[PDB]
Point group: C5
Chain length 314, copies 5
C-alpha cells in the first residue's frame, strides 16, 4: 500500500490526519510541539529520500531504511538517533513466523517512522495520545519513542506465549503419538526459535545502549522509563534461550520413544516366530512322503515352555 500518518500533540490538545501527499507533512519538522510521523510503505523510494533530504539525515541511513533483512541496532548522530526494529507475526498451525522491519529517527520534536506494510503494534500508543491517557501528553518526543518501543516490546510477550503452547503441544506428540510429520514440526520450531533469538539478542543491546548513553533524550526524566523497557528485554532474551534449550533435547526424546516401540514390535514378531517356527516344522516333516495325539501334546508341551520363558523376559 501507500499512506502517511502524523500525530502532532501537546499537553493541551492534539491533531491527526491521513494523507498520501508527502509535501503536506514536511513543515512539522520545526514543531515546538511533539509529532509522530508514520510512513507506511517504504517501497516508494522517492517519498523516503524526500523526507530524508529535508530533515538532514545521511543517505546511508536512508539506504538502510530501504534494505529490509537487518540486525536491530542503534546509531547516534549529531542531532538524531537511528534505530532498526523488527516486529513479528506468527501464523499458528501453519507453523510459520513473519517479520516486518521498522526504522526510527529521533530529531527535534518528531519521531519518524518507516513501516514496510499496514497493520502494526502501536494501536495502543495511538489511543493514549487521542484520549489523553497516561503521561503521554505531558512529555516530549523522546518519551513518544519510549511509548513506541515499549508497545512493540510487549508484543513479543504474547508471541512468547503462543510458542509456549506449541512446545507443550509437541512434548506430547513426541512421547505418545510418534509420527512422521512430528519430526518436521520439531525442527520447524527449533528453526524459528533461532530466528527469534537472532533478533532479540541485538534488541537488548539496542535498548541497553539507549538507556546507558543519552544525548537529546531528556536524562533524569525519561531514562528510567527506558530502563524499565531494558528490564523487559532481558526477561525475553532469557526466555528464548530457555525454550531453545528445551526444544533441543526434545528430538532425542522422540528418538527414545520411537526406538522403544521398535523393540515392542520386535518381541511380537520374535515370540510368534519363535513358537510357530518349530511347530510348522514337525508338521512339515510328518509330511515326508515315505500316537497321533502324542506329537500334538509334545507340540503343546514345547509350545507352552516357550510361553513361560517369555514371561522371564519380553
Amino acid at each position: 500500500d501507500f499512506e502517511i500518518e502524523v500525530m502532532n500533540y501537546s499537553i493541551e490538545e492534539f491533531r491527526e490526519f491521513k494523507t498520501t501527499d508527502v509535501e503536506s507533512v514536511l513543515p512539522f519538522r520545526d514543531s515546538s510541539t511533539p509529532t509522530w510521523i508514520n510512513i507506511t510503505g517504504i517501497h516508494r523510494t522517492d517519498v523516503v529520500q524526500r523526507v530524508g533530504e529535508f530533515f538532514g539525515i545521511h543517505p546511508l541511513v536512508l539506504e538502510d531504511i530501504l534494505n529490509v533483512h537487518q540486525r536491530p541496532k542503534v546509531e547516534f548522530f549529531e542531532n538524531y538517533v537511528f534505530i532498526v526494529l523488527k516486529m513479528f507475526t506468527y501464523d499458528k498451525n501453519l507453523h510459520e513466523l513473519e517479520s516486518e522491519q521498522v526504522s526510527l529517527i529521533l530529531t527535534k520534536n518528531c519521531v519518524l517512522m518507516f513501516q514496510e506494510k499496514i497493520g502494526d503494534v502501536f494501536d495502543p500508543v495511538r489511543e493514549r495520545i487521542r484520549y489523553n491517557r497516561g503521561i503521554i501528553r505531558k512529555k516530549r518526543a523522546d518519551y513518544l519513542l519510549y511509548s513506541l518501543i515499549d508497545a512493540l516490546v510487549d508484543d513479543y510477550f504474547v508471541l512468547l506465549e503462543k510458542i509456549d503452547d506449541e512446545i507443550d503441544v509437541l512434548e506430547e506428540e513426541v512421547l505418545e503419538r510418534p509420527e512422521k510429520e512430528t519430526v518436521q514440526r520439531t525442527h520447524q520450531l527449533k528453526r524459528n526459535l533461532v530466528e527469534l533469538a537472532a533478533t532479540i539478542w541485538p534488541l537488548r543491546e539496542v535498548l541497553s545502549s539507549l538507556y546507558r548513553d543519552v544525548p537529546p533524550l531528556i536524562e533524569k526524566e525519561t531514562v528510567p522509563y527506558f530502563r524499565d523497557v531494558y528490564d523487559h528485554t532481558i526477561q525475553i532474551a532469557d526466555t528464548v534461550e530457555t525454550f531453545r534449550d528445551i526444544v533441543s533435547g526434545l528430538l532425542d526424546v522422540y528418538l527414545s520413544s520411537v526406538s522403544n516401540k521398535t523393540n515392542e514390535v520386535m518381541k511380537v514378531l520374535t515370540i510368534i516366530a519363535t513358537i510357530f517356527m518349530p511347530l510348522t516344522f514337525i508338521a512339515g516333516i510328518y509330511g515326508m512322503n515315505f500316537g497321533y495325539p502324542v506329537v500334538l501334546a509334545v507340540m503343546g508341551v514345547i509350545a507352552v515352555i516357550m510361553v513361560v520363558y517369555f514371561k522371564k523376559k519380553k
Copy 2:
C-alpha cells in the same frame, strides 16, 4: 485465602497477632521497634494498595507486587528497599513443581511481606522472635530481613536433596527398567531444573546488589551477614548447574540401554530363523509328489554345526 500477621518486638518483649482488618496494623509504620508485617494473599488488591498508599509506596512497585510472573529482583528507593522472590514446592511422584512469588519491602523499622497463598518457610524465624532465640531481638529491621531471606535460601537446599533423590531413582530405570514413563519423568526433570536455574541465577544477582551497595542498612554491622547468604546463593547455583550437567547426559544413557536390548531379541529370532529355515526346507523337498534316518542324520549334523557357529558369537 487472606490474612494479616504482624509480630512486633524489641530487645525486652514482643507481641504478635492476626486480623483481616488492614487499618489495625497501619499504625505500626511509626514503630521505634522492629515489626514484621505479613500480608498473605495478594488478590485483595485494595488492602495491598491502601497500605501501598499509607506507607508511601509508589504504584509501579505496588503493581509489581500484583503481577506474580516476574523476574526475581531488587529495587532501591529513597526511604525504602524493594525485593521480589520466588518460592518452590515440588510434588514428588507427579513430578511437578509450583511457584509462589514472595514480595517484600524494608522501610524505616518495618518489613512488609506479601504472599500469594497461606503456607511458607518463615516459621523458623517466627519462633526465634517467639521464644527469643539467637541475637534477633538485639538487632534491627534489616537483620529481620536478612533473617527472613536467609530462611528462604535454606529452603532451596532440601529442594536440592529431594531432586537429587529423583536423579538416583531415574538413573536406575534408565539403565535397568527400560520403559515409556521413564522417558517422561526424565524430560519432566529437565524442565523443572531449567525453571530452577532460571530463578536462582537472577535470585543470585539480587543478593549481590544488596551486599555491595547497602543504603539504609546499618552498614558495618549486617553487610557480612548478607555476604554469608550471598554465598549460599552461589552454592545452590553450582549444585544446580551440576545436576543440569548430569541429567542432560542421562537420556543418552537409556537410549543406549534399549539399543542394547534390540541386539538381544535379534539373536533370539536370528538363530531360531537360522536353524528351522533350512530344516523345514529339506523336509519340504521330501513332501513332494514324485534310509529315512539318514535324513535326520544330516539334520542333526548341521543342526549342531550351527549351534557351534554361534559359540563364535552371542
Copy 3:
C-alpha cells in the same frame, strides 16, 4: 596466470592498462592522483618482492603476502596500512568451496592489490572508475579501498543465499528422501560452514579495528563509509552463526526420521509374519501322514486371521 593491472584516475580523467612488465607500474608510486595496482598471480614472488623494495614495505609483510594459509588481519604502519582478505567460490552440486587470498596495502595514493589467480569480485568497482559513476572519482586512494572492500563483503551475501538454498533442499531429503548420499552432503555442508565462519569472525575484526582506530585515512568524510561495510560485516558474522546452529542439529532430525521408517519396515514384516506363520502351520499339520468338514478349517482360519487384523487396529 600472471597479470599486472593499473588504473590511474582523478576527478577529470583516468587511464588504464594491462601489463606483464613490473617496471612499467612502479613510477605510479609518485602519483598525485589515485592509483589501483592489481597484481594477479603471487607465485611470481620476484615481482612481489620488487614492488616491495621499491615502495619501502617491510619484508615481513611482503612474505606474509605469499603465505596463503592465513588469518585475515590488519596491521597499521607509519605510512601504510596492511590488510588481508579472503574471497570465496562455492561450487554448487559438488558442494565444495575454494577461497583465494587477496592482500592490500594503502599508501600515498596507491591501493596495491595482490591476488592469487585471475578471477575476482571487483569488476563492478572497475565499472565505477571507468564509466564515471557514484562518487568514486571525486574521492581518493582510501575511499577506493572501502569501495574495494565493500565489493567483496557484498559477495558474501551471494554465497549466503546459495548456501541458504543448500539447506532448504537438504531438509526434504532428511525427512522424505532418506538415503546414503544425503548424509555425505550434510557433512560437506557443515564442514564448509566451519571453514566459512572461521574466516568471517576475524573479518569482522578487520573492519572493526579500521573504523575505531584510524591512521593515515581520509577519515572525516569516509569513516562513516568504513563503518557502513563494518555494519554489513557483523550482519553476516551473525547470519553465519544462524546456519551453524540450524545445521548443527540437522543430523539428529534425520536420525528421528530414519528410525521412524525402520519401525514401519518392522510392522509390515510382523503383521505378515504373525498371520501367515500360524495359518501356514494349521495348514501344515493337515499335511501329517497319519490316518484320521474341510471348510471349517478355512473358516476357523478365516476367523482367527481376521482377529489378527482387528488386533492391529489396536496398534500398527
Copy 4:
C-alpha cells in the same frame, strides 16, 4: 570419634602429644614457638565453641566450620586467616568418592585445624617435623600452613592417576566388550568428575586468593611457595577438564559400537532368510495334491546367485 593433637616445634627441639581435653591445648595460643593444634571429630560443638571464643574467632566462622557442605574459601581477618578445604577419597570398585572438610585458621603462632573424622593426608607433614627434614623447622606457622596445604593438593594427583586408569580401562570395554554394566561405569565416571571439578574450580580460587593479597603471612619470603601450590591448582583443573571432554563422548563412542553389531546379526538373518525363504517355497509348491534334479539344480543355481549378490556388500 574425638581427639586433639598438638605439635609445637622450634629449630632446637619439639614436642607433641594427643588429648581429649580442650583446656590443655589453650595456653599454646601464647606460644612464642609455632604449633599445630589439630582438632579431629568436630561433632563436639561445645569444644569447637570454647576455643572459638578463646582465640578470639568471630562465631560466623565457627558456624561455617561446623557446617560440612561448603565451598573451598578464603577470608582474612585482623588477627587471623581462615580457610575451608575438602579432602577426597575414591573407593575404587564401588565407583563412589567421599569428602571430608578441613577448616583452618592461622593466628599468632598456631595453625588451627578442624576435621570431621580421624584419617587425613597430613601425615607427611608431621614426619618432616618429627625428624627435622627440609626447612620446615626453620620456618613459621604460615609455612606450616602452606605445607599442610601443599600436602592436600598433591593428594589430588594420586587421585588423578586412579581416575586416569578407570578411563584407559573403560575405553577398552566400550570398543571391545559391549555390555549393560559397562554403561553404568561410564556414567559413574561422569558423575565423579563433575563433583570433582566442582570442588577443584573454586579451590583454585582459594589458592589464587592467598597469593595476590597477603596480610599477615611474612610476605616476600612465603609468597613464591604458595604460588607453586597455586600453579599446581591450575594444572589440576585443566587436567580435570580434559577428562570431562574425553568422557562426554564416550557413550557416543559406545553407542556406535553396539548399533554396529546389530548391523551384522541383521545381515546374518537376512541371507539365511533370503536364500531359503524362496527355496522352501519352490519345494513347498511341489507338494501339491491335484526332472527332479532340474529343480535342485535351479535351487543350486538360485542359491548360488544370492551368494554372488552378497559379494557386492556384506
Copy 5:
C-alpha cells in the same frame, strides 16, 4: 642419553662445543658475549642442581625443570625469566603423538635450555649462528630466545598439516567404508586433539605475556618479533579449534551412515518375506491331504502386485 651443547657467539666470531662435564660450561655465566646453553637429557638431576645453584636460580624452578608433566608457563624474577615449553611429535598411521618438555631461563647473556632427550627442532637456529645467516649474529640473547621460541612454533604447523590429512582420510571412511576399527581411530584423534588443545592454549599465554611486559627483553628492537610469534600462536589455536568442532560431529556422522544401512538390509529382508510368505502359505494349503495353473497365475498376479507396491517406496 646425556649431553651439554653450548654456543658462545659474537657479531665478530663464534665458538660452540659438546661436553658432558658440567664445570666447563659454568664460566660462560660471566660472558660479555651472548650464550646459549642446551642441556639435553634432564634425567641427570645432579647437573640441573649444579648449574641451577651456580647461576643462582631458585629451587622451585629447578624442580619444575624436572617435573616434565607440566602446564607450559612463564614466571618472572629479579635477574631471570622462566619459561616451560613443550614440543610435539606425531606418529602418522599409528595415530599417536608423544611430547617433550623444554624449559628455558633467560638470565644475563645466557639462555639455559633443558631437554629430556636428543632430537629437537632447533637445527635451523644452530644454522643461523654457525654460517652467519640472517641477523641473529648481530643480535643478542633475547633475539636468540625469540629465534628459538619461533622455530618451535613453526613446528606446530607441519604438525597441523599431518592432522588435516588424517581428518580428510578419516571422513572418507565414515561415509563410505563403515566398519569397527574406523570408530576407534576417531576417538584416538579426539584424544590427541584434546592433548594438543590443552598444550597450545597456554603456549599462547606464554607469548602473550612475553610480548606485553619486556624487562631484560630489549624493548623496541625485538618485541616486534615476539609479537610475530605470538600471532602464529593465535592462528594455531584458531586452526586447532577448527578441528575440535569438525571431529566432535564425525562420530554422529558415522552413526547416521550405519543406521541407514540397517534399513537397506531391512528392505531386502522384508520383501523376500513379503512375497515368499503368503506364497509359501498357499503351496502349503494345497499340500493338504483331504485348474492347476490357475493358482500359478494368481500367484503371478499377487506376487507382482506386491512388486508394484514396493516401487511405491524401496
